[PDB]
Amino acid sequence: AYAAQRLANESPEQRATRLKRMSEYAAKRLSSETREQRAIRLARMSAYAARRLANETPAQRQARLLRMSAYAAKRQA
DNA sequence: GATGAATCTATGTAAATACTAGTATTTACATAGATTCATC
Helix, strand or coil, X not given: CCHHHHHHCCCCCCXXXXXXXXXXXXXXXXXXXXXHHHHHHHHXXXXXXXXXXXXXXXXXXXXXXXXXXXXXXXXXX
């Protein structure tokens, strides 16, 4: 429950450094990933998305449809 | 094979926590596509 403190720390594009490091761990983490582990990570992620799609408002739904409609249509290039 | 929706995912980073108030690492979730599927 010691989280609450961290929320506070906010900073001057040292925040750039932090992200660059977050993205460095991630990359590395995925390179160590076994094929079983990756399937399991994607299986959760597809589960989370199915949820979020089941709970979308009609406003969310339509913005998603409009967006994809525009994207698919635009990819005739 | 044209079109549009359902489903899945590469990418990014908030949030939480492990580890020794602060730093370091890991987990959970969220964006914005990219791909698969349904239908005509």
